[PDB]
Amino acid sequence: AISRTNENDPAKHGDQHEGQHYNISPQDLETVFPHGLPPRFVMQVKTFSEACLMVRKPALELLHYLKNTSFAYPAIRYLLYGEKGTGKTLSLCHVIHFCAKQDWLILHIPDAHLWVKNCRDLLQSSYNKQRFDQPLEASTWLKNFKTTNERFLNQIKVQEKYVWNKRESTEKGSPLGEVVEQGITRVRNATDAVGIVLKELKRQSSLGMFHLLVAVDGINALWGRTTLKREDKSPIAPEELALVHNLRKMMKNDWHGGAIVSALSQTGSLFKPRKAYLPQELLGKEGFDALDPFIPILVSNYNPKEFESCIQYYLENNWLQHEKAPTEEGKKELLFLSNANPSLLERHCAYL
């Protein structure tokens, strides 16, 4: 079992654990990741009956930066970038799993591209009539945010009175969970309930009650274009969505007591060519100006050690059934056809 590591605690992974797979427990899988993992990685988790992630240099560097973070300075933006299918999403998942074990409050947006396309129930916000609500998309996120952070919802308490309706309000000092519940029961107030949650988490973390991790995958969605339309078939801008408007405030480094980790993604993006992967190209001028200053972290294809360990993990799970796959010539052909790309290698190994 040369491709596995017995150290399953992400607070202790280092350069000697590079290329080795560590196991995430079922309890961690259900609590930390209700929504984060890639759609094609959960298939592997269901078929292998276990979720093992490889340790790689991007995640190790980003964990080194988060261990030596000063919680008094303004939050530092870390941006994972790389070519398609290089593994930046699972790097972000490694970092989220590290922070969740250390009792950070996780604010995980699994894919921000879903908020700017293919929305059926689009409303006009009663709070601000110049913005639009996405109840199905906000209530879906609230349930998983509740799942990940069940413990803190009673400890954290609001600091203002929030008025949902003339009959119904959340009075100062109530637990944050109530707000979350108000978004999960009545979807009409889901989008207003998300913003309040954000407004609370960004503030109380500055006071020092908890550490906050803002994990946003596909962050390039926030400063691009949408494919949503009005009834007169006119385009809608991203800043006109309350769900997208409230999440941009979190990317600004005007709060301390936490970190902002994010990953670019051309997959699911709107109006971007297939081969665009660099930070400015995907973000745009507006996006770069917003995130600037930030620390970019590069995710590349597997190096020979990582590629060999990934095929050894698949062999240990008996997932390569072709008789020639275990052989050296089969490994060279997999290497050429995938070019050590994790996503291409996984897709090729799926049907062998």
């Binding site: 059934q321 072709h322 052909e333 799926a350 049907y351």
Partner: protein, 208 residues
């Protein structure tokens, strides 16, 4: 044809050329020397020297093709193989210790055995005389029966009774049924074997 009659088909087998000179028979040696002189056609897009190459799966993919869309046909084929692999892993993980030794998880073995279970041995050929076409039983050649298994599988999966069930999932289910000697394709083989035994009157015409 744009190729002259002189041009010969290429031989893409990679272990054939490495055969040592000592093992060469005089006849094989003569053939090897003769190919030195001949003109050879360019290898077509398709078969390669890869070790994962499988001619049967390639022919199945070509038979599923519509309108020259090879990307989609191969995508469907690989989706079907992945689905078979995942279903067999599902069944293997839920099986007892003694039932796990008899669960095949290689999708290629399943595909080959499923197609083999659907191959007919006898068919009917019409023959013309007297104005009346006569249906005579005939032993099918190997090519014909291999083709018929594939054609029956694809026609069974294209049936319109399967509303909105996607082709990969229909085809994986049909393949796993045929792997166990069940399903409509095996019944279509049986209904030809019975309709050829019902007409053994003209069973000995050997000149179809």
């Amino acid at each position: 044809s744009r190729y002259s009659p002189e041009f010969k088909d290429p031989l893409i087998d990679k272990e054939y050329y490495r055969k040592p000179v000592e093992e060469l028979t005089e006849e094989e040696k003569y053939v090897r020397e003769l190919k030195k002189t001949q003109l050879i056609k360019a290898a077509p897009a398709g078969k390669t020297s890869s070790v994962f190459e499988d001619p049967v799966i390639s022919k199945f993919t070509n038979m599923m093709m519509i309108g020259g869309n090879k990307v989609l046909a191969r995508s469907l084929m690989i989706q079907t193989l992945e689905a078979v692999k995942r279903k067999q892993f599902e069944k293997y993980h839920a099986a007892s210790a003694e039932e796990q030794a008899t669960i095949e998880r290689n999708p290629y073995t399943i595909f080959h055995q499923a197609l083999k279970n659907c191959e007919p041995m006898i068919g009917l050929v019409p023959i013309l005389k007297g104005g009346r076409f006569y249906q005579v039983p005939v032993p099918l050649p190997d090519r014909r029966r291999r083709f018929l298994a594939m054609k029956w599988m694809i026609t069974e999966c294209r049936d319109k009774k399967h509303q909105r069930t996607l082709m990969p999932e229909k085809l994986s289910h049909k393949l796993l049924e045929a792997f166990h000697n069940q399903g409509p394709v095996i019944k279509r083989k049986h209904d030809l074997h019975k309709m050829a035994e019902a007409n053994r009157a003209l069973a000995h015409y050997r000149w179809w």
